[PDB]
């Protein structure tokens, strides 16, 4: 459940046009928001490995 | 070299003796708990993936 | 002996005057909250019975 930059599948330089209207909601916790505004800060902690 | 390859396993995991493999495919992973905290110009939101 | 048998009831419970019993069977108990924490050789897991 992570994103690597190699998923773009293009070595070299480019600019991306992100579709902000068609943002689907697959898995939603209470944290999950659709409309970001300004400077986005996300602080997560991982505990209880099994 | 047992002592070398035994060190690579994570500190929390200690596997048992036998393993009855009955297929040509095995998934291996862990069940972690994520405690996310979001902050932007609109406001704050706190969640938790159990 | 009121003062003797009154002492047996738990400190949190203080019952009211009247009780309209309308059957030959009465369940009595409490609704508690349990916060369990598990640890073994495989790893750790944390839950909560609300």
CSV table of C-alpha atoms in Angstrom, one decimal:
chain,number,residue,atom,x,y,z
A,1,UNK,CA,0.0,0.0,0.0
A,2,UNK,CA,2.6,2.6,-1.2
A,3,UNK,CA,3.5,4.7,-4.3
A,4,UNK,CA,6.9,4.6,-6.0
A,5,UNK,CA,7.9,7.2,-8.7
A,6,UNK,CA,8.7,4.3,-11.2
A,7,UNK,CA,4.9,3.8,-11.6
A,8,UNK,CA,5.0,6.8,-14.0
A,9,UNK,CA,6.9,4.5,-16.5
A,10,UNK,CA,8.9,7.4,-18.1
A,11,UNK,CA,12.6,8.0,-17.4
A,12,UNK,CA,13.5,11.7,-18.1
A,13,UNK,CA,11.8,15.1,-17.3
A,14,UNK,CA,8.1,15.9,-17.5
A,15,UNK,CA,5.1,17.9,-16.0
A,16,UNK,CA,1.9,16.2,-14.7
A,17,UNK,CA,-1.8,17.5,-15.1
A,18,UNK,CA,-3.7,16.0,-12.0
A,19,UNK,CA,-7.5,15.5,-12.4
A,20,UNK,CA,-8.9,16.9,-9.1
A,21,UNK,CA,-12.6,16.5,-10.1
A,22,UNK,CA,-12.5,12.7,-10.6
A,23,UNK,CA,-10.9,11.8,-7.2
A,24,UNK,CA,-12.7,8.5,-6.3
A,25,UNK,CA,-13.1,7.3,-2.7
A,26,UNK,CA,-11.9,3.6,-2.5
A,27,UNK,CA,-10.9,3.3,1.2
A,28,UNK,CA,-12.1,6.1,3.6
A,29,UNK,CA,-10.9,6.5,7.3
A,30,UNK,CA,-12.0,9.7,9.3
A,31,UNK,CA,-8.7,11.4,8.3
A,32,UNK,CA,-9.6,11.1,4.5
A,33,UNK,CA,-10.4,14.4,2.8
A,34,UNK,CA,-11.1,15.1,-1.0
A,35,UNK,CA,-10.3,18.9,-1.2
A,36,UNK,CA,-6.8,19.9,0.0
A,37,UNK,CA,-6.1,23.7,0.6
A,38,UNK,CA,-2.6,25.4,0.9
A,39,UNK,CA,0.3,23.5,2.7
A,40,UNK,CA,-0.6,19.8,3.4
A,41,UNK,CA,1.0,18.2,6.5
A,42,UNK,CA,0.5,14.4,7.1
A,43,UNK,CA,2.2,12.8,10.3
A,44,UNK,CA,1.7,9.0,10.7
A,45,UNK,CA,3.0,6.4,13.2
A,46,UNK,CA,3.2,2.6,12.6
A,47,UNK,CA,2.9,0.2,15.7
A,48,UNK,CA,1.7,-3.4,16.5
A,49,UNK,CA,3.5,-5.5,13.8
A,50,UNK,CA,2.5,-9.2,13.5
B,1,UNK,CA,25.7,-19.6,6.3
B,2,UNK,CA,22.7,-19.8,8.8
B,3,UNK,CA,23.8,-17.1,11.3
B,4,UNK,CA,24.1,-14.5,8.3
B,5,UNK,CA,20.7,-15.2,6.7
B,6,UNK,CA,19.0,-15.7,10.2
B,7,UNK,CA,20.0,-12.0,11.0
B,8,UNK,CA,18.0,-10.6,8.0
B,9,UNK,CA,14.6,-11.6,9.5
B,10,UNK,CA,12.9,-8.8,11.6
B,11,UNK,CA,13.4,-8.8,15.5
B,12,UNK,CA,9.7,-9.3,16.3
B,13,UNK,CA,9.3,-12.5,14.0
B,14,UNK,CA,10.6,-15.9,15.2
B,15,UNK,CA,9.3,-18.7,13.0
B,16,UNK,CA,8.4,-22.3,14.2
B,17,UNK,CA,10.1,-25.5,12.9
B,18,UNK,CA,7.7,-27.0,10.3
B,19,UNK,CA,5.8,-25.4,7.3
B,20,UNK,CA,3.4,-27.5,5.2
B,21,UNK,CA,3.7,-25.7,1.7
B,22,UNK,CA,0.8,-27.0,-0.5
B,23,UNK,CA,0.9,-24.6,-3.5
B,24,UNK,CA,3.2,-22.8,-6.0
B,25,UNK,CA,2.5,-19.3,-4.5
B,26,UNK,CA,2.9,-17.9,-1.0
B,27,UNK,CA,2.1,-14.3,0.2
B,28,UNK,CA,4.1,-13.0,3.3
B,29,UNK,CA,3.7,-9.7,5.1
B,30,UNK,CA,2.6,-8.1,8.5
B,31,UNK,CA,-0.6,-6.6,9.9
B,32,UNK,CA,0.4,-3.0,11.2
B,33,UNK,CA,-1.7,-0.2,12.8
B,34,UNK,CA,-1.4,3.4,11.2
B,35,UNK,CA,-2.3,6.5,13.3
B,36,UNK,CA,-2.5,9.4,10.7
B,37,UNK,CA,-2.9,13.2,11.6
B,38,UNK,CA,-3.7,15.7,8.8
B,39,UNK,CA,-3.4,19.6,9.0
B,40,UNK,CA,-3.9,22.3,6.2
B,41,UNK,CA,-5.3,25.9,5.8
B,42,UNK,CA,-9.0,24.7,6.0
B,43,UNK,CA,-8.3,23.0,9.4
B,44,UNK,CA,-7.2,19.7,11.2
B,45,UNK,CA,-8.5,16.1,10.9
B,46,UNK,CA,-7.4,13.0,12.9
B,47,UNK,CA,-8.0,9.3,11.9
B,48,UNK,CA,-6.6,5.7,12.5
B,49,UNK,CA,-6.3,2.6,10.1
B,50,UNK,CA,-6.9,-0.3,12.6
C,1,UNK,CA,-29.4,-5.8,59.7
C,2,UNK,CA,-29.6,-3.0,57.0
C,3,UNK,CA,-26.0,-1.4,57.6
C,4,UNK,CA,-24.4,-5.0,57.2
C,5,UNK,CA,-26.2,-6.0,53.9
C,6,UNK,CA,-26.0,-2.4,52.5
C,7,UNK,CA,-22.2,-2.6,52.7
C,8,UNK,CA,-22.1,-5.6,50.3
C,9,UNK,CA,-23.3,-3.5,47.3
C,10,UNK,CA,-20.5,-2.0,45.1
C,11,UNK,CA,-19.3,1.6,45.8
C,12,UNK,CA,-20.4,2.9,42.3
C,13,UNK,CA,-24.0,1.5,42.5
C,14,UNK,CA,-26.6,3.5,44.7
C,15,UNK,CA,-30.1,2.2,43.9
C,16,UNK,CA,-33.4,4.3,43.9
C,17,UNK,CA,-36.4,3.7,46.2
C,18,UNK,CA,-39.1,1.9,44.1
C,19,UNK,CA,-38.7,-1.2,41.8
C,20,UNK,CA,-41.8,-2.5,39.8
C,21,UNK,CA,-41.0,-6.3,39.5
C,22,UNK,CA,-43.4,-7.8,36.9
C,23,UNK,CA,-41.9,-11.3,36.3
C,24,UNK,CA,-40.4,-14.4,38.1
C,25,UNK,CA,-36.9,-13.8,36.6
C,26,UNK,CA,-34.5,-10.8,36.8
C,27,UNK,CA,-31.0,-10.5,35.3
C,28,UNK,CA,-28.6,-8.1,37.1
C,29,UNK,CA,-25.0,-7.1,36.0
C,30,UNK,CA,-22.8,-4.2,34.7
C,31,UNK,CA,-21.6,-2.8,31.3
C,32,UNK,CA,-17.8,-2.6,31.6
C,33,UNK,CA,-15.1,-1.6,29.0
C,34,UNK,CA,-12.1,-4.0,28.4
C,35,UNK,CA,-8.8,-2.8,26.9
C,36,UNK,CA,-6.8,-6.0,25.9
C,37,UNK,CA,-3.1,-6.0,24.7
C,38,UNK,CA,-1.6,-9.2,23.1
C,39,UNK,CA,2.1,-10.1,22.6
C,40,UNK,CA,3.7,-13.4,21.4
C,41,UNK,CA,6.8,-14.5,19.2
C,42,UNK,CA,5.0,-13.6,15.9
C,43,UNK,CA,4.4,-10.0,17.1
C,44,UNK,CA,2.0,-7.6,19.0
C,45,UNK,CA,-1.7,-6.8,18.6
C,46,UNK,CA,-3.9,-4.2,20.5
C,47,UNK,CA,-7.8,-4.2,20.6
C,48,UNK,CA,-10.7,-2.9,22.8
C,49,UNK,CA,-14.1,-4.3,23.7
C,50,UNK,CA,-16.3,-1.2,24.0
